[PDB]
């Protein structure tokens, strides 16, 4: 939330649903990385 919340304001039209904007959603995003499932796509959004 401190690193990536409010920061995924891309002027694309694609949806980046595993983000850090709320605490429930941020929570959903961390558990996704812990399973390993598509964790690099979350990391690609945080680098951009």
């Amino acid at each position: 939330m401190q690193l990536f919340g409010g920061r995924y304001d891309f002027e694309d039209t694609e949806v980046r649903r595993s983000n850090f904007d709320n605490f429930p959603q941020a929570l959903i995003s961390v558990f996704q990385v812990l399973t390993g499932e598509d964790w690099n796509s979350v990391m690609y959004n945080g680098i951009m």
Binding site: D9, F10, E11
Partner: protein, 973 residues
């Protein structure tokens, strides 16, 4: 350097030489003599330009009242017809049969969607429509993203099908009527007669994105004019996908706006700035909107959201009352994503009585709260619209006219007034046209006042085109000379009818398209703007014309006579022409119509020839096998009779013209006698010249070709070898030199063009022209313009014999008014002949203007094309310079200095002609440039708008504004 008397005496022997060559070889005094020798083949009638204007003002009244009656009946039927519609939903059981435009007409297709059944129509080809058409039914346009077969759409094609009987009753009564169309609230449009749409959906690869609701004609009759004010939320939360969406909605929202509508655009993030340079509500014409659509784009989101400073700034903007304003519907629309504050306090005072209407738009996919925004919309009798997507922008930024139309549909019959649109290009490629609109209202159960839930919307709008080629048939210019014309005007200053007005759209800015970002097959929008050229932009502006222009916006009558300068047909000359204007109002409408005449055009020739042999004898004069003793004759494509058509291949036309008089006597019971007759009389007058005068002197030495461009279209170049090089328009009322010869009382020289293609230099030569000038009973007439193409080689020999060929001491040149180079001493200059003299030695030309020898006026041509700049053609503005003598003084001596050198130039003007002779020391002795002073259509982007609108042109708005009915529902958002 020779003295001023030596140049004086040496000009006078070579302006006496050119004029004697032109007075003798052309035959000015001979053609004057034979117009006066006869006196009785014709009579001389007056142009009563009080009377002519009054007569014209009434054919446009009756034309536009006849259109109006048709519009009223269609509206009545539509209202009555839909009040008896039952709203069925079983459409696979009972098919709706209609012909759908933009569908393959191939019989073997057979798609057969459920609910609907198509028509294969038969499609005769037509005139007054330049496309194949069917007169048995009306076509239907469904927009592309709208599905047809929806119950909402299927039920229009049911009830709207009773219009084809009233459609037919309008054209039976009036054959000349153009498109008749009903634009539905549903987005479905039906027009008669049926023809295939110009863009099919998927059979080519360009796809139409045309919506009836979006259309300007539909919009003006949808609702009343309006002062809007777009607020843009620029807080930090918006940045992202949502910010991207807003910039495209506002541009989209504007498309909706019209000239009668005023609009500004503000933006807030804890302070409200205004997006551009304007600060008040501006006219939202093509230009102003272009400024706002160019400042909406550069916005960056940053900062705290404040709806209190955003609506304070909005209300203050709404209350200016010093500026020119629409003063009708006052509404403010805010684009934003989510709001935590309802700003209850700002609305209490600023709009305690709800005079203003507030529309709130929530855009993008986001989680911000929408309850406060919805509340604002509900409180203010506005509406709420979401936009998540780009495909959602187009139907929500046009949909607010359903709200603004409400207090019009509660006005009853008082709201059913025909309004006529600005000229614009027709959807179907007809040409420039104006549409008269009327709104249809949804009346169901009126007898008893049973519902009214959705009875506060319009069913749609009904329109009927007038083509501008139909109005130009009520304003005949043939009796009047090429100089005379009729100009039509809005109460907005735009010109309904003008010689200068053109089909190409009026352009704004310098066009810049990026080739690195345009895909090879996606098909962007082309254009939709109206062609709003203004009267002070169709003609050179004066102060004594802004008086005339304002005086006939506020519906007055009058005349005016003054000296002003006419821009030439080609854009190279300016000639001081003493004109008279005369205006009157078209009493049915808000148009006022005027008429320009040049004193001396107050009398015309009517042909009074009726004898059997005399009309016969003059008619074989224009036979193309008989050009060996007559001269390569031409003929202007007038609409002589209805049957023989203007063809643009002139040998084609003159055969079909001259076949027509042999196969039938010129009495011709469906064809105007005077126009053909005058031509016949004229051809017996440009014959007796070519027989009894020009064929005596078969070769003059320096004379190349000899013409008589006359009134009656018949131009006669004298050898057929010369007539191949005659590159003029064969219509005599479109020739540039014809019109410059009439203004002047002296021989006129026309400079040949520089570069280009075709032979226009040594081969044809520089031409002199001169209007014929006769007096009948003390009444001035100018019937014709004689002339000569000169031989440039011979002229040089006379000129050579203190200037010598390949001279290095000093060079001398002859320049006609406008500064073009005709004759040059050096031989590196006479290769570049007909070129603007400020491009071959720009230092001298610059000085000449300073001495007061030359004057000029830069103007803007708002209808021209140019190549794009990197940042096939678009429309753009060009600035155009013309040059003209402003000082009557004959001679001008002096010296110009560049820095470290002097050059002593001597200038003398030849008497009796526009030509000027200048002697100066060789350019090579002082190596000087300044910069190259060039005279061309030069792409530019002026005038700057932000300075026009601080002192706008006078204007008059619509008298009736419908808004704020007390019994409006104001409960649906």
């Amino acid at each position: 350097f020779p003295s001023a008397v030596t140049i004086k005496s040496w000009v006078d022997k070579m302006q006496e030489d050119l004029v004697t060559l032109a007075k003798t070889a052309s035959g000015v005094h001979q053609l004057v003599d034979i117009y006066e020798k006869y006196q009785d083949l014709y009579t001389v009638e007056p142009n009563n330009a009080r009377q002519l204007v009054e007569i014209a003002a009434r054919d446009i009244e009756k034309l536009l009242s006849n259109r109006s009656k048709a519009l009223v009946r269609l509206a009545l039927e539509a209202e009555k017809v839909q009040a008896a519609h039952q709203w069925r939903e079983d459409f696979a059981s009972n098919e709706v049969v209609y012909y759908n435009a933009k569908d393959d007409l191939d019989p073997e297709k057979n798609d057969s969607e459920p609910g609907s059944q198509r028509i294969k129509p038969v499609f005769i080809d037509d005139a007054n429509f330049r496309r194949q058409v069917s007169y048995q039914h009306a076509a239907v346009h469904i927009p592309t993203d709208i599905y047809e077969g929806s119950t909402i759409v299927l039920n229009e094609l049911n009830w709207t099908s009773a219009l084809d009987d009233v459609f037919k009753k309008n054209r039976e009564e009036d054959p000349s009527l153009l498109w008749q169309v009903f634009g539905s609230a549903t987005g479905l449009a039906r027009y008669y007669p049926a023809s295939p749409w110009v863009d099919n959906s998927r059979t080519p690869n360009k796809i139409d994105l045309y919506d009836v609701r979006r259309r300007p004609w539909y919009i003006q009759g949808a609702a009343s004019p309006k002062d809007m004010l777009i607020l843009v939320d620029v807080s930090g939360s918006v940045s992202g996908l949502t910010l991207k969406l807003i910039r495209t909605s506002v541009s989209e929202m504007l498309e909706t706006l019209s000239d009668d509508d005023f609009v500004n655009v503000a933006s807030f993030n804890s302070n409200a700035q205004d997006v551009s340079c304007f600060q008040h509500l501006v006219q939202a014409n093509v230009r102003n909107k272009k400024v706002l659509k160019d400042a909406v784009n550069n916005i960056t989101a940053k900062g705290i959201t404040d709806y209190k400073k955003g609506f304070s700034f909005a209300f203050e903007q709404l209350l200016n009352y010093n500026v020119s304003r629409a003063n009708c519907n006052k509404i403010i629309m805010l684009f934003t994503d989510g709001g935590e504050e309802r700003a209850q306090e700002i609305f209490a005072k600023y709009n305690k009585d709800k005079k203003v209407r507030v529309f709130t738009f929530s855009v993008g996919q986001h989680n911000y709260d929408r309850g406060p925004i919805q509340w604002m919309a509900c409180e203010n009798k506005g509406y709420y619209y979401e936009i998540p997507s780009i495909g959602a922008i187009r139907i929500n930024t046009q949909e607010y006219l359903d709200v603004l139309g409400r207090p019009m549909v509660l006005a009853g019959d008082k709201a059913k007034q025909v309004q006529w649109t600005n000229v614009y290009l027709d959807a179907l490629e007809l040409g420039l046209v104006i549409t008269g609109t009327l709104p249809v209202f949804n009346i169901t159960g009126q007898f008893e006042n049973k519902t009214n839930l959705k009875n506060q919307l319009i069913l749609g709008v009904m329109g009927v085109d007038v083509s501008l080629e139909d109005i130009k048939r009520l304003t005949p210019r043939f009796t009047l000379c090429p100089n005379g014309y009729y100009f039509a005007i809005d109460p907005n200053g735009y010109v309904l009818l003008h010689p200068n007005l053109q089909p190409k759209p009026i352009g704004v800015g310098i066009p810049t398209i990026n080739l690195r970002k345009r895909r090879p097959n996606v098909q962007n929008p082309k254009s939709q703007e109206p062609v709003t050229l203004d009267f002070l932009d169709a003609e050179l502006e004066n102060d004594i014309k802004v008086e005339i222009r304002n005086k006939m916006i506020d519906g007055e009558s009058g005349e005016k006579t003054f000296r002003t300068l006419v821009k030439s047909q080609d854009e190279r000359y300016i000639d001081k022409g003493n004109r008279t204007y005369t205006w009157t109002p078209v009493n049915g409408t808000d148009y006022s119509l005027a008429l320009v005449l040049p004193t001396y055009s107050f009398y015309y020739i009517k042909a009074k020839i009726e004898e059997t042999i005399t009309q016969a004898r003059y008619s074989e004069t224009l036979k193309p096998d008989n050009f060996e003793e007559s001269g390569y004759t031409f003929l202007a494509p007038r609409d002589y009779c209805s049957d023989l058509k203007p063809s643009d291949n002139n040998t084609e036309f003159l055969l079909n013209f001259n076949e027509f008089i042999d196969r039938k006597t010129p009495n011709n019971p469906s064809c105007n006698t005077d126009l053909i007759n005058r031509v016949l009389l004229d051809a017996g007058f440009t014959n007796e010249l070519v027989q009894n005068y020009w064929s005596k002197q078969k070769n003059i030495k320096g004379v190349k070709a000899r013409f008589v461009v006359t009134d009656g279209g018949i131009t006669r170049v004298y050898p057929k070898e010369a007539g191949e090089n005659w590159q003029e328009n064969p219509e005599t009322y479109e020739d540039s030199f014809y019109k410059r010869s009439l203004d002047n009382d002296n021989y006129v020289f026309t400079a040949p063009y520089f570069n280009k293609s075709g032979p226009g230099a040594y081969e044809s030569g520089i031409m002199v022209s001169k209007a014929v000038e006769i007096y009948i009973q003390g009444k001035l007439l100018k019937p014709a313009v004689v002339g000569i193409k000169i031989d440039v080689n011979s002229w040089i020999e006379n000129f050579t014999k203190d200037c010598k060929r390949n001279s290095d001491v000093m060079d001398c040149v002859i320049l006609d008014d406008g500064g073009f180079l005709l004759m040059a001493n050096h031989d590196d200059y006479t290769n570049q002949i007909g070129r603007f003299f400020g491009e071959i030695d720009p230092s001298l030309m610059r000085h000449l203007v300073n001495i007061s020898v030359y004057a000029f006026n830069k103007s803007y041509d708002y209808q021209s094309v140019c190549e794009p700049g990197a940042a096939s053609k678009q429309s753009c503005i060009t600035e155009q310079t013309q040059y003209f003598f402003d000082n009557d003084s004959k001679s001008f001596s002096g010296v110009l200095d560049c820095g470290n050198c002097s050059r002593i130039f001597h200038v003398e003007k030849l008497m009796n002609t526009n030509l000027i002779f200048i002697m100066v020391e060789s350019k090579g002795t002082c190596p000087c440039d300044t910069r190259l002073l060039i005279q061309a259509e030069q792409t530019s982007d002026g005038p700057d708008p932000c300075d026009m609108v601080k002192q706008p042109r006078y204007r008059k708005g619509p008298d009736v504004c419908f808004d704020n009915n007390v019994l409006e529902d104001y409960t649906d958002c």
